[PDB]
């Protein structure tokens, strides 16, 4: 039973350890730990909130240079984004009833995305430009992910997508 004291040291150890890495009286520890755990959870959601807004504004900015084709706003721009981003943008542009494609340079390859807020099909538009840039990908009707090897101009793009519009659907 002489190990009943060596354990008491254990407890006092652990307490002061944690209690110290937060710079607080070992007696005001629980209170601050609770607080910190809260902030930690808040910050977690807050960051996720901010990430949203950024893609929001970002999409908005992308609409600012849109082209028109049958009252439809076509968006085609090269962007400094990772795929996850391009996807967060594709959706957003789509919900605004726009149609087009976004590309972004990746290491070794080019990330591509296509969105549709109209009857046209994302996947359909994607292949179409995929043939041009030499690559493939798939997705849904309103959004489509893809990877390619050649980076195209906003012109080359618009050109590609314009055909797809004037032809594949009317």
Among 2, 3, 6, 40, binds a second copy (CB under 8 A): 40
5 binds a second copy (CB under 8 A): no
- Cβ nearer to a second copy, comparing 55 with 101: 55
Report which of 117, 167, 116, 125 is spatially closest to residue 146, judged by C-alpha positions: 125
Show the site string, 102-141: x = touches a second copy by CB under 8 A, - = not: ----------------------------------------
How many CA within 13 A on the CB side of residue 84? 2
Nearest to 66, CA basis, from 77, 55, 57, 58: 77
Residue 92 CB, nearest distance to a second copy (Å)? Answer: 13
| Distances 131 to 15, 64, 158 between C-alpha atoms, Å | 64, 28, 15
Residues 6+ positions from 34 with CB-CB distance below 8 Å? none
- Member of 26, 138, 149, 150 binding a second copy (CB under 8 A): 26
Helix residue spans in 1-138 (DSSP H): 6-20, 29-63, 83-95, 122-133
Residue number with CB closer to a second copy (15 or 134): 15
Q: Kindly tell me which of 56 and 153 has the beta carbon lying closer to a second copy.
A: 56
Q: Which residues bind a second copy (CB under 8 A)?
A: 8, 10-12, 14-15, 17-19, 21-22, 26-27, 29-30, 33-34, 36-37, 39-40, 43-44, 46-47, 50-51, 53-54, 57-58, 60-61, 64
């Amino acid at each position: 039973g002489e190990a009943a004291i060596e354990a008491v040291e254990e407890m006092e150890r652990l307490l002061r350890e944690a209690s110290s890495i937060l710079r607080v009286e070992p007696a005001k520890l629980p209170k601050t730990v609770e607080r910190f755990f809260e902030e930690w959870k808040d910050q977690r959601k807050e960051i996720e909130r901010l990430k949203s807004v950024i893609a929001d504004l970002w999409a908005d900015i992308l609409m600012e240079r849109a082209e028109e084709f049958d009252s439809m706003k076509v968006v085609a721009e090269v962007v400094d984004a990772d795929m996850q981003a391009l996807q967060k943008l594709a959706e957003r542009l789509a919900e605004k009833g726009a149609v087009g494609c976004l590309m972004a340079k990746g290491e070794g390859k080019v990330f591509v995305v296509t969105f549709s807020g109209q009857k046209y099909d994302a996947r359909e538009l994607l292949r179409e430009i995929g043939r041009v840039a030499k690559g493939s990908g798939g997705g849904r009707k309103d959004v489509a992910q893809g990877a390619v090897q050649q980076l195209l101009d906003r012109e080359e793009m618009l050109d590609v997508i314009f055909r797809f519009l004037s032809e594949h659907e009317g």
